[PDB]
Amino acid sequence: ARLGRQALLFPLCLVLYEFSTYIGNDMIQPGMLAVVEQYQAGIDWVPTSMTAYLAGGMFLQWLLGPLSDRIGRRPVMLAGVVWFIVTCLAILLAQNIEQFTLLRFLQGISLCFIGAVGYAAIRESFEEAVCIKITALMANVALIAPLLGPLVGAAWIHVLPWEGMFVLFAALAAISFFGLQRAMPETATRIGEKLSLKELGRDYKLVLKNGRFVAGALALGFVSLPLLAWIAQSPIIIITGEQLSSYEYGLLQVPIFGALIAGNLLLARLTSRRTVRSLIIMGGWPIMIGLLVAAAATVISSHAYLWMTAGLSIYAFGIGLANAGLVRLTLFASDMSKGTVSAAMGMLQMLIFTVGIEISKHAWLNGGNGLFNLFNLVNGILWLSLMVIFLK
Numbered sequence: 131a132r133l134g135r136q137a138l139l140f141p142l143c144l145v146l147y148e149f150s151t152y153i154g155n156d157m158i159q160p161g162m163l164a165v166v167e168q169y170q171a172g173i174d175w176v177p178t179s180m181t182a183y184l185a186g187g188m189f190l191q192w193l194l195g196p197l198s199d200r201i202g203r204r205p206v207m208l209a210g211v212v213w214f215i216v217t218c219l220a221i222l223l224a225q226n227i228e229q230f231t232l233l234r235f236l237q238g239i240s241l242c243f244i245g246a247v248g249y250a251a252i253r254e255s256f257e258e259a260v261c262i263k264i265t266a267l268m269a270n271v272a273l274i275a276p277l278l279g280p281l282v283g284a285a286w287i288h289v290l291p292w293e294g295m296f297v298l299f300a301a302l303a304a305i306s307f308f309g310l311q312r313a314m315p316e317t318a319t320r321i322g323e324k325l326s327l328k329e330l331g332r333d334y335k336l337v338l339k340n341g342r343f344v345a346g347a348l349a350l351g352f353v354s355l356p357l358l359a360w361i362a363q364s365p366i367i368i369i370t371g372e373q374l375s376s377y378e379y380g381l382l383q384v385p386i387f388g389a390l391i392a393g394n395l396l397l398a399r400l401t402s403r404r405t406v407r408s409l410i411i412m413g414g415w416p417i418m419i420g421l422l423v424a425a426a427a428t429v430i431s432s433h434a435y436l437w438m439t440a441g442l443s444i445y446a447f448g449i450g451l452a453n454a455g456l457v458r459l460t461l462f463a464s465d466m467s468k469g470t471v472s473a474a475m476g477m478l479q480m481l482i483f484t485v486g487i488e489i490s491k492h493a494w495l496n497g498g499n500g501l502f503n504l505f506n507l508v509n510g511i512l513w514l515s516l517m518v519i520f521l522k
């Protein structure tokens with residue numbers, strides 16, 4: 131029974147779970163100033179919270195798709211949601227910033243269930259028509275989270291304890307659990323079949339031998355790093371570094387993630403008249419200019435954070451315009467199984483984000499805003515360099 135009238139509870143709950151894991155990062159980052167204060171830990175642990183969450187994402191990423199294909203998408207997906215609930219609640223017991231961070235890593239493992247199993251089940255459960263719309267809703271949730279998250283998170287710790295946020299993530303995921311339990315059908319085709327790890331390994335060695343695919347996958351990591359570095363470090367840059375208020379922290383998010391959204395909106399209006407190569411080249415202009423603006427300004431004066439914010443906004447507009455197209459070309463740069471190709475590009479991005487956020491951290495700690503933005507600029511140049519190869 132492809133799709134249905136009453137079968138929309140399944141994708142809706144999947145979306146709710148997706149949202150909960152996304153704010154599980156985006157609400158937490160501004161809350162990390164309170165966390166670090168509670169544990170009497172240094173501010174260098176603030177970005178690391180995100181680093182750890184992301185690192186957990188790439189842990190089972192290569193695994194879940196083929197495994198869920200064998201044991202069923204239903205038990206694996208439900209397992210992931212429960213694991214998220216449990217680890218969200220468990221972090222309330224952490225006792226130090228090291229154990230807090232460990233639990234961030236453990237929580238982050240829940241991230242890869244979305245794409246590798248839930249989404250695979252969506253594609254198998256639904257007519258392309260309905261599937262396309264569900265994908266859009268999911269993409270829209272991913273767009274709303276980094277805008278809504280820091281605002282709601284900043285508003286939260288002003289009143290309520292950081293522990294409450296984790297109870298909220300768990301509560302939302304619990305709702306999605308019971309919905310998925312009653313709704314989500316079993317779409318796995320390979321149930322009962324044997325799973326060869328050595329053969330899985332060979333599939334990954336093969337995707338990684340494709341140079342054009344690797345360039346696009348790496349490019350996607352590099353180009354999105356400045357944005358994630360901002361998400362990771364904006365609380366310490368703004369509140370600790372510029373000694374600004376929480377209200378200003380929230381306000382600075384508006385042009386940046388508003389621009390991201392606006393770039394996506396322009397993308398939607400232009401898609402029928404452009405194609406992908408031209409849209410990547412088009413987004414390339416604000417991507418490079420915005421990063422150049424943030425870097426130049428903060429090298430001139432370390433404290434010009436409005437110019438930094440402006441440059442990041444311009445860059446974010448380009449990202450909204452360029453990224454989705456590069457995702458598409460990268461996926462089809464390899465003719466191997468889409469599950470494998472997807473997981474591979476997911477892991478390569480997370481590798482870059484994890485290491486890149488930590489490097490960004492040391493950049494800012496040592497050099498301030500100038501270094502933060504200069505590192506972001508090199509990342510833009512890496513993307514650009516890969517694009518001249520990828521597009522030729």
Ligand SMILES: C[C@H](CCC(=O)O)[C@H]1CC[C@H]2[C@@H]3CC[C@@H]4C[C@H](O)CC[C@]4(C)[C@H]3C[C@H](O)[C@]12C
Nearest residue numbers: 152155156187241245275276358472476479480
């Ligand atoms: C890249 C993968 C999956 C996409 C893919 O496989 O192509 C995704 C899945 C989970 C996603 C993260 C969820 C938490 C964060 C939400 C933020 O609002 C945007 C940055 C983060 C850090 C996301 C970045 C990226 O979008 C991660 C790793």
Ligand SMILES: CCCCCCCCCCCC[N+](C)(C)[O-]
Nearest residue numbers: 328329330332333336466467470
């Ligand atoms: C019609 C030609 C292909 C027939 C051979 C199929 C055998 C099973 C392959 C399973 C898929 C996994 N792998 C590792 C090959 O990528």
